[PDB]
Amino acid sequence: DCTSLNRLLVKRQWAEAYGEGTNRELLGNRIWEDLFANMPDARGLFSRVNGNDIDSSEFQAHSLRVLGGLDMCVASLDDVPVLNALLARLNSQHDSRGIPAAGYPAFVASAISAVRATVGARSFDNDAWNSCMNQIVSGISG
Amino acid sequence: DCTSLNRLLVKRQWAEAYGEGTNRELLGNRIWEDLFANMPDARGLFSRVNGNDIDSSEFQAHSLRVLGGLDMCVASLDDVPVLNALLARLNSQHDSRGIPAAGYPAFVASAISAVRATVGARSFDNDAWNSCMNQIVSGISG
Amino acid sequence: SSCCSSEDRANVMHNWDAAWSAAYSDRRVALAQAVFASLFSRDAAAQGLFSGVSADNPDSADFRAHCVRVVNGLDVAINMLNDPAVLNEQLAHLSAQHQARAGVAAAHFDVMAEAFAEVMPQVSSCFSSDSWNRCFARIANGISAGL
Amino acid sequence: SSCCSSEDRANVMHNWDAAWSAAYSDRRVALAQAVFASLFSRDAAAQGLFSGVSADNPDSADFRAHCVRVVNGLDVAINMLNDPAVLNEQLAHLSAQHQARAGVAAAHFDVMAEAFAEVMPQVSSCFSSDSWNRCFARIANGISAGL
Amino acid sequence: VCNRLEQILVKTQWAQSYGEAENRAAFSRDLFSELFNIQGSSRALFSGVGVDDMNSAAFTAHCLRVTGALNRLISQLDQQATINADLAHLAGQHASRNLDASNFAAMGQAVMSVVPTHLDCFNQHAWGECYERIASGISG
Amino acid sequence: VCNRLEQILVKTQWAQSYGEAENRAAFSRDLFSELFNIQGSSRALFSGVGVDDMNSAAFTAHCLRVTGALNRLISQLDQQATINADLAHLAGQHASRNLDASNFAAMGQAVMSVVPTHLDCFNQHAWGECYERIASGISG
Amino acid sequence: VCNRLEQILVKTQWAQSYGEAENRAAFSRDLFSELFNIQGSSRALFSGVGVDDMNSAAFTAHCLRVTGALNRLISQLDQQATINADLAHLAGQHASRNLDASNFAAMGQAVMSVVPTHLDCFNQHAWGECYERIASGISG
Amino acid sequence: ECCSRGDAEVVISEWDQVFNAAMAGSSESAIGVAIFDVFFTSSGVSPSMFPGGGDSSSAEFLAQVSRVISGADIAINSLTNRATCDSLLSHLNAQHKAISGVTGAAVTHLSEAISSVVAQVLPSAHIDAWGYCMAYIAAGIGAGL
Amino acid sequence: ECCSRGDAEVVISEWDQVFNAAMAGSSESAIGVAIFDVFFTSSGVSPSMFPGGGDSSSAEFLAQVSRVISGADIAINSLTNRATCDSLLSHLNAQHKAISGVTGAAVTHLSEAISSVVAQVLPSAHIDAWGYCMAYIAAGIGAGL
Amino acid sequence: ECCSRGDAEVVISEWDQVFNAAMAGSSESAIGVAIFDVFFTSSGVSPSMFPGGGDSSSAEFLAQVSRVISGADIAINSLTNRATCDSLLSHLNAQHKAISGVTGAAVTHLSEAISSVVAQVLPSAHIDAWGYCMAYIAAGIGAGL
Ligand code: HEM
Ligand code: HEM
Ligand code: HEM
Ligand code: HEM
Ligand code: HEM
Ligand code: HEM
Ligand code: HEM
Ligand code: HEM
Ligand code: HEM
Ligand code: HEM
Ligand SMILES: [Ca+2]
Ligand SMILES: [Ca+2]
Ligand SMILES: [Ca+2]
């Protein structure tokens, strides 16, 4: 359950990890290296944004789009009506792309792993992060 | 294609990553940990230079030999006649060792990954590095 | 032609990050709502372009999420001003998303620019209007290019 | 017996790295070519040992690549002077590769030493001849050991 | 009064001044120092909280309660029904003290004399509007 | 308005803020920056002095003339007949520009947004009184 | 003249002196300063590039073109056919100016007075050889 | 000592970590409601005695929650000066003495609810320092109750 | 160059030394009257053309004196940025072109009156830097006059 | 402003990154030929008008390429002092006015060819700063053409 207190911790640690400017690209890099290492068949879904070269401008812009999508949701975790409307649009933006359902739990793991590495394991709460990330991908996957 | 401009970038970033003295050993370490993690059956090819202990003097000297071989080639990328002659000797030095052809694309990936980690992902160009590394292993493998 | 300079970008990113609520959407909704109110006041027809997100009810979840998306779009672009190679890809993306929207024209981005130029001085401490106008142009011209 | 000392190694590595072209082979070919010319001038017979790499045509690709290999061999060894456990393995390797070469004898490394001692003062700024002679011995003795 | 955008500037600049202060006790004391300097008649209203020694624990405590009150109000400026309830509570804690409008205008000037000296950016008008919002809720 | 004691605080704090500023050009520009941020309609009044680029020499010059005007007035605040003459001169340089009272209130808020951010001590009321003294002399 | 090894020292020491200079404009100006100090008759040859004020943009520009010329030549010292072509181009840009050998010897002394003062290591002879290579290409 | 200077500085530091520049001024309400939820369970006290009856949808209670967090913020931020802190505690003690049914144990239960919620939102929290410094606060607020 | 950056910095420094924290805001009037006295002598210009007729007892002239010192303060304090300074000089040039009987020589005479009075009140003044930087100011104000 | 001091410093920094201690003095030729290749495509200008006819095997063109890169190096390294830079641009402008068939558009095409090749060899390059500072250079070299 992504509880009131879960949301607070996910909000605070997301804000610290996301950060400013090019440092957002650092976060994004951890995610996709981990994701494509674990699920290298997912890389082909990103052919239009040059998923074979994650350091390219095309993929870096996509990477930063995802992080912003994620930032919208974290920022809206306390406002479920706005949250649902954001996930609905995110859901349109992912449907009929042949995205395997296993890509989502795997993305969640890569994202949580990147955040943990940015803010520090000792400060970290896997339960709160898993509960709130699942509420987000449950709205997107489908 | 390892173009004129590709060669320039590979030259410049190789020079920055290779460096001096024991710091070359750092680069070499990234490569073989990654290579032997992905292809742990390749480790047996290095029995004579103690591939089971990559931190030993025997393997460290071999590691530094490879990096120098690589440095010769990067330095000669603009001089194809000299490049071919270097790859020919490198080719003699690898034949009839039972080296699987998959060891080469895997080595290229480990090497490019180590270089990227030394010079920084944001400065990096995977296309240029893959094109020029392939011209090098195409001369060795066989 | 006046350019959004290196120093122009630092001012904008400073004004933006300092008025930014990193963890909560209330503030960025409030910023977008005053922006759209301004935009619709200058161009009463523009509002019809946003029927798909319930523009006639600015306090609805449906429109407040469109608010979050626009502000997010701007925040991402603003934060890419130090990596303009990346910024170009992102504006070409925003461009296509706005080409798919019947009625949206480059003229609307000028009204949008006036709406931000009116609202930012009211949320941003020590707001540099010149740096903003030039880097907002840099961003908005990239989105409105082709339409 | 005079030793290639910690301070001797720093001087050599400084002179070497400062005359080194990190990205291009032209310079290290030029260094090796003047070295071999010197070597062959002191020992006209030595040249016959390099028939396998077209020594009679010093401007050929075939010989210019042998030049890159020798210089590379030296650069690797010089750079290992701060990890002499590693250096020992590498010289024992160079040793065996030169044992497989009919005609090569330890006396040739003395002529080679004279050839570098003549050429380095012409490529290297502030060249420390004493530090070089002692650490070149340290390296060359390890290659010529056993032959 | 104190619209949704004016709240942003006030919340931010309250944070960069009060929320970044090295010594919240000194900051709170400076505020009542000014108020007294601005309106010497105001000082005797605080005979219950040891105003005679402004460095007393009793008076530092009062100063902290008030800047704490200021802080909890500025943070709920966007939550109209919460702050109205909280303002009405504060009004009831001041009603018996026979305060007048000059007292609240003096407090506001104290507020806006102290706050900008701990900032690089200050929006006078935004602050006047939102101080009026609070004072009007407290004065009744 | 602006009595003899209020003049002391204003003169001092003008000196410690404006008179100690590292970059008088930036300080003067910040003041008109605020004014525009406070009242966007004010900006077009300055089309004659290159307002379109606030970092132009033409516009920096204007900003310096005004803060220079502010400085020469604050220094003669105690010399009632001198400043009245000087204020009447400034009034004649503004009369043709069809300014209204909102323009002068905006300038005052700009003045009192910028000045305290360069101080440790600020007396709001003293400044309001003495800005009114100047604006009233200039507006007519 | 200027063999393959001498080129290495010159290229390196050009880089550590000219290529590491904080102020390439000053460096280039110092060079013509020396030349004039070494041969006062040389100065009037530069009446076309504002030599009268050595800190003029016009004269700093000339100085930058020349040290830029020096830089592009030293970098192509190993590419014999390229530099010969480039030297012949430079010779044609100097032929009309009726220069003599004392002018080129003075420039060389200027070159070798300025360059070592920005180094820890200097090879005089290597530099004399390779300056002669350039001057001989330019003088004809 | 019990809640030493080093204890206090950690509690203030971590309280401020919870209420950093991102979370300050937007998260107090969700924190305080969570604290009360924890408190109603452990104390068995009736929400009906509170303004708005404990109704986290009631503006009267949200403001009541706002005061409680603030008073905690104030007391905590004064932990480094114990003379000032004792006075703030005594004021709070007097305010609750005027209230029917506030017991010393319920006060302890509320102070501990603050620590436990802080630990839930800040897993690195030094729960011993919090235990020591909240018990000092709870003894001051609930003295003679 | 004529009134270099180092020249300007000295003039600004010494102008500020004259108008230090003690003297700023009380001595401008006595300075400016002294400057005009020096100026009327060297220029032969009529005090009657000035507001209050040059009467240092006249409030109209004291304010006129106040403007002149201020405009000098402004021009001087902008000596380090010559683009900004040229604009200020051009504004002053336009204002005096609107005035019957202002000559280039009288302008030079007034700029030099400022240097000489500064030297009288600040004996260490670098009269060469002042000479250079006041002539640059006088050429801007009196251009085409 | 267009190509501000901060813009210029980045362009100089990245130009120097391309021509670092390893690459300076060996890579100018391959860079310049790449720039011309890009330029011949975008401009449609004839290689025949250039020395050696655009033949990257021709020593006459390689030296021509060497001059062009140098002149760019010089102009770029002078971006921080715009008075000096304007003079260098004017000299280059005069040199190309003496040349039949150099147009303002072709000049823009060559300046942009430099940015794009720099970005190809330095992926982190700040292509906006380059765009601004190369257009300032192109306007100076191609003024009145
Ligand atoms: C929290 C989870 C995720 C978020 C917030 C997210 C966010 C986004 C956003 C904002 C876009 C841009 C939409 C547009 O403008 O077209 C996008 C595109 C896309 N995402 Fe996701 N994403 C998530 C998970 C995933 C996963 C798990 C996959 C596949 C493994 C995926 C695959 C894609 C693809 C294929 C696209 C379209 C790429 C293109 O533009 O060509 N996403 N995503
Ligand atoms: C760019 C690619 C490579 C370069 C530059 C390189 C370089 C070298 C060099 C210089 C040596 C020393 C030769 C000698 O003196 O005997 C060597 C030996 C060797 N390399 Fe490679 N190598 C490369 C790729 C690979 C790969 C992909 C493999 C296997 C996965 C491999 C396996 C070996 C083996 C088995 C030896 C002999 C080890 C021994 O001395 O016992 N190499 N290599
Ligand atoms: C800097 C300026 C702007 C930014 C950053 C921006 C950003 C965005 C974003 C992120 C979306 C969602 C795209 C999607 O999900 O397909 C969007 C949608 C849209 N935008 Fe903008 N926008 C800007 C200016 C404008 C202007 C000036 C107009 C018209 C006056 C406009 C009209 C629309 C419309 C009609 C939609 C689709 C509405 C809907 O989803 O139902 N945009 N914009
Ligand atoms: C510090 C001194 C030297 C170093 C670092 C060095 C290095 C090398 C290297 C790396 C090779 C290639 C080995 C292979 O690929 O099998 C080589 C080959 C060879 N070396 Fe040396 N060498 C040195 C001294 C000498 C001397 C003094 C001689 C004889 C005068 C010599 C004779 C040869 C010959 C004949 C070959 C094989 C030629 C060929 O490949 O056809 N070396 N050396
Ligand atoms: C408008 C902003 C104000 C705020 C936020 C504020 C806040 C407070 C607070 C928190 C208390 C302590 C209540 C308690 O917990 O017991 C208090 C008490 C008091 N306030 Fe204010 N106050 C304000 C304005 C004023 C003004 C304008 C005056 C008078 C000039 C004033 C006079 C008093 C007095 C006399 C007390 C009682 C002191 C005692 O206990 O003896 N307050 N105020
Ligand atoms: C109350 C304080 C003010 C002072 C001390 C002041 C001072 C000045 C000064 C020194 C000048 C230059 C006169 C000259 O030498 O030519 C000027 C011009 C001007 N002022 Fe003010 N001013 C004040 C208020 C205002 C206000 C409130 C506004 C409008 C919002 C305003 C609008 C203007 C305009 C439009 C000009 C003419 C610019 C031009 O030349 O085109 N001023 N002021
Ligand atoms: C040997 C090294 C020299 C180099 C690399 C060199 C380089 C240059 C360069 C690049 C130019 C500018 C051409 C252009 O783009 O318009 C130039 C012009 C000139 N050089 Fe040299 N030069 C050298 C020696 C000399 C000497 C020895 C003198 C006289 C003492 C001299 C006198 C001149 C003159 C008079 C001009 C023409 C200035 C004008 O435009 O009025 N140069 N030189
Ligand atoms: C650490 C422990 C506690 C803290 C920090 C705390 C803090 C506060 C504060 C700051 C106020 C507002 C006082 C005012 O301005 O009038 C308050 C009021 C109140 N508290 Fe507490 N409190 C604590 C424990 C308790 C407990 C344990 C109870 C119940 C058993 C309780 C019941 C109340 C009630 C009923 C009010 C008055 C509401 C009203 O009449 O407006 N408190 N408390
Ligand atoms: C360094 C030289 C000078 C400086 C810095 C200077 C400065 C000034 C300034 C700041 C003003 C006020 C402009 C305004 O606000 O309207 C002014 C006005 C005036 N100046 Fe000058 N001035 C200089 C030289 C002269 C000279 C040489 C004369 C006479 C020959 C002169 C005659 C006047 C007169 C008559 C006025 C106008 C008084 C009025 O109509 O209100 N000035 N000057
Ligand atoms: C950014 C733009 C450009 C730069 C930096 C540049 C730079 C240069 C330089 C430094 C020279 C050598 C001048 C000398 O020493 O005589 C030169 C010559 C020349 N340039 Fe350009 N140029 C540019 C654009 C162009 C364009 C667009 C064209 C053709 C349409 C062109 C055609 C030529 C030709 C034909 C010469 C003369 C070759 C000769 O007669 O020796 N340039 N340029
Ligand atoms: Ca301050
Ligand atoms: Ca300050
Ligand atoms: Ca020196």
Numbering used by the authors:
A (entry chain B), B (entry chain B): 1 to 142
C (entry chain C), D (entry chain C): 1 to 147
E (entry chain A), F (entry chain A), G (entry chain A): 1 to 140
H (entry chain D), I (entry chain D), J (entry chain D): 1 to 145
Article sentences:
Here, intermediate forms of the 400 kDa giant Hb from the tubeworm Oligobrachia mashikoi are reported. To overcome the above problems without any artificial modifications to the protein or prosthetic groups, intermediate crystals of the giant Hb were prepared from fully oxygenated crystals by a soaking method. The oxygen saturation of each subunit was determined by occupancy refinement of the bound oxygen based on ambient temperature factors. The structures revealed that local ternary-structural changes are induced at an early stage of oxygen dissociation, and subsequent global ternary-structural changes and large quaternary-structural rearrangement might arise when about half of the oxygen molecules have dissociated from all of the subunits.
Finally, we obtained four crystals with 69%, 58%, 21% and 13% oxygen saturation, designated Crystals 1, 2, 3 and 4, respectively. Crystals 1 and 2 were prepared by the pre-soaking procedure, whereas Crystals 3 and 4 were prepared by the pre-processing procedure. The structures of Crystals 1, 2, 3 and 4 of OliHb were determined at 2.4, 2.7, 2.2 and 2.1 Å resolution, respectively. The average occupancies determined by the B-factor analysis (68%, 51%, 19% and 7.5%) turned out to be slightly lower than the oxygen saturation determined by microspectroscopic analysis for all four crystals. Besides the structural transitions around the heme pockets, the largest ternary-structural changes between the oxy and deoxy form in each subunit are observed in the AB loop region. In Crystal 1, the conformation of the AB loop of the A2 subunit matches that of the deoxy form, whereas the AB loops of the remaining three subunits shows the conformation of the oxy form [Fig. 3(c)]. In Crystals 2, 3 and 4 all of the AB loops show the deoxy conformation. These facts strongly suggest that the AB loop of the A2 subunit is most flexible and most readily transits from the oxy to the deoxy form in the early stages of oxygen dissociation. The side chains of these arginine residues are oriented towards the solvent region in Crystal 1, whereas in Crystals 2, 3 and 4 their orientations are shifted towards the space between His F8 and the heme. The bulky guanidino group would affect the coordination geometry between the heme iron and the proximal His F8, and may reduce the oxygen-binding affinity of the heme.
